[PDB]
């Protein structure tokens, strides 16, 4: 299991709270959360409560500022713990309902354009080892979490589109 420490203020100060399980409302404990520390496991922070807004992928390490975990927007009133770390297999599909060209990955892909021509995914099948799609390559944009399941559209993970640049697998071992 994962275990992080979130601090209402940066540099790990002010009020602090340790979460070892999925949460939908941290407002009562944290009013901001400008920094975080991940001891183990992969955690995701949501700008909105009940995971209803933007998400930030966090991994084992120390973050003294939000902008470090890709915090595009301060705040953060909820957080979830990402399960799965065994095998990592996923089958991205061009069109919805697993239609059109398909490609399967089993590791990190910094540059999809090298493995899959299409620059967007409108569906995918995650068998194991949750994944994290990135709008662009070199992981420097938006990020979406794909838990183990069956996706037939991009709206499943609440996305503005399908545009995909890269993808990684979530590991709690590291």
Curated annotation (Swiss-Prot):
Superkingdom: Eukaryota
GO cellular component terms listed in the entry, alphabetical order: cytoplasm; nucleus
Signal peptide: none
Family: Belongs to the beta/gamma-crystallin family.
Organism: Homo sapiens (Human)
Xref: InterPro entries: Beta/Gamma-Crystallin, Beta/gamma_crystallin, G_crystallin-like
Designated name of the protein: Gamma-crystallin D
Any one GO molecular-function label of the UniProt entry: structural constituent of eye lens
């Amino acid at each position: 299991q994962g275990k992080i420490t979130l601090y209402e203020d940066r540099g790990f100060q002010g009020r602090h709270y340790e979460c070892s399980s999925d949460h939908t409302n941290l407002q009562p404990y944290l009013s901001r959360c400008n920094s975080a520390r991940v001891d183990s496991g992969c955690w995701m922070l949501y700008e909105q409560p009940n995971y209803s807004g933007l998400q930030y992928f966090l991994r084992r390490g120390d973050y003294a500022d939000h902008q470090q975990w890709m915090g595009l927007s301060d705040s953060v009133r909820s957080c979830r713990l990402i399960p799965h770390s065994g095998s990592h297999r996923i089958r991205l599909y061009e069109r919805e309902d697993y239609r059109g060209q398909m490609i399967e990955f089993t590791e990190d892909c910094s540059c999809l354009q090298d493995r899959f021509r299409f620059n967007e995914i409108h569906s995918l099948n995650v068998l194991e080892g949750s994944w994290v799609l990135y709008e662009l390559s070199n992981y420097r944009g938006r990020q979406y979490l794909l838990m183990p399941g069956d996706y037939r559209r991009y709206q499943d993970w609440g996305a503005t589109n399908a545009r995909v640049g890269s993808l990684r697998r979530v590991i709690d071992f590291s």
